[PDB]
Amino acid sequence: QPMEEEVETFAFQAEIAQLMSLIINTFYSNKEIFLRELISNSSDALDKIRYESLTDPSKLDSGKELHINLIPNKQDRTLTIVDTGIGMTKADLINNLGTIAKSGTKAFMEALQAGADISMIGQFGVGFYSAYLVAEKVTVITKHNDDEQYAWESSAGGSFTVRTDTGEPMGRGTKVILHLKEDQTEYLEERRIKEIVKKHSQFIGYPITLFVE
Numbered sequence: 001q002p003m004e005e006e007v008e009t010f011a012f013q014a015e016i017a018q019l020m021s022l023i024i025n026t027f028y029s030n031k032e033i034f035l036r037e038l039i040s041n042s043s044d045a046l047d048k049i050r051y052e053s054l055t056d057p058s059k060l061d062s063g064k065e066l067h068i069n070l071i072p073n074k075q076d077r078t079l080t081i082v083d084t085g086i087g088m089t090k091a092d093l094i095n096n097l098g099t100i101a102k103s104g105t106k107a108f109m110e111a112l113q114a115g116a117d118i119s120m121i122g123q124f125g126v127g128f129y130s131a132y133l134v135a136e137k138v139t140v141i142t143k144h145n146d147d148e149q150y151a152w153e154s155s156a157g158g159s160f161t162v163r164t165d166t167g168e169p170m171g172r173g174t175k176v177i178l179h180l181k182e183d184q185t186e187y188l189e190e191r192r193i194k195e196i197v198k199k200h201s202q203f204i205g206y207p208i209t210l211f212v213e
């Protein structure tokens with residue numbers, strides 16, 4: 001006592017910050033697509049660890065099952081999406097969630113200006129930010145082989161934090177925790193989640209399981 005935790009704060013690239021502002025404040029009526037985008041990202045992460053394991057089977061020693069889990073929680077108002085994909089290193093987190101999306105978010109924002117639909121966000125490689133359609137804050141917990149477990153967090157205030165996660169180890173993969181907006185709690189309902197998964201992610205090549213109490 002006490003334990004000491006160092007936290008690093010980073011600014012988003014200007015265009016990523018602009019897109020996050022647009023997304024978190026839009027009145028877009030087809031917000032359910034956020035789940036499709038996150039599940040698609042998880043599928044890609046699972047494809048990556050599968051690819052590595054083609055050459056080195058020991059890459060799955062940290063977790064043999066390749067799947068996606070959905071966990072709603074009405075008591076803390078969160079929807080969690082967990083995958084056992086490749087996971088991210090600290091640099092992956094800092095770069096892929098705060099800097100590398102600048103180009104894509106710019107191309108997407110120009111597309112929106114030209115009449116494109118928000119549902120096309122995934123084609124620009126920045127679908128992760130669609131989480132802010134329904135969430136006021138997002139927490140990302142990730143674990144990559146040969147690296148420590150990290151926690152990323154942002155409330156779309158122009159910055160994000162990264163720190164070493166002291167919580168329960170994940171083995172390998174990524175956990176996206178959506179802290180839902182007060183008027184978006186419908187996404188915590190078992191029936192609504194099933195409907196959205198069937199409608200937009202039925203053909204995902206990894207098992208998607210919905211955990212309920």
Ligand SMILES: Oc1cc(O)c(-c2noc3ccc(NCCN4CCOCC4)cc23)cc1Cl
Pocket residue numbers: 038040041042043044045046083085086087088092096125126127128173174176
């Ligand atoms: O929602 C997520 C779920 C994930 O598994 C990962 C993830 N785990 O390991 C990963 C390793 C690399 C990357 N790349 C970030 C850029 N995106 C573009 C769209 O396809 C997915 C990758 C993501 C993840 C990231 C997010 Cl944002």
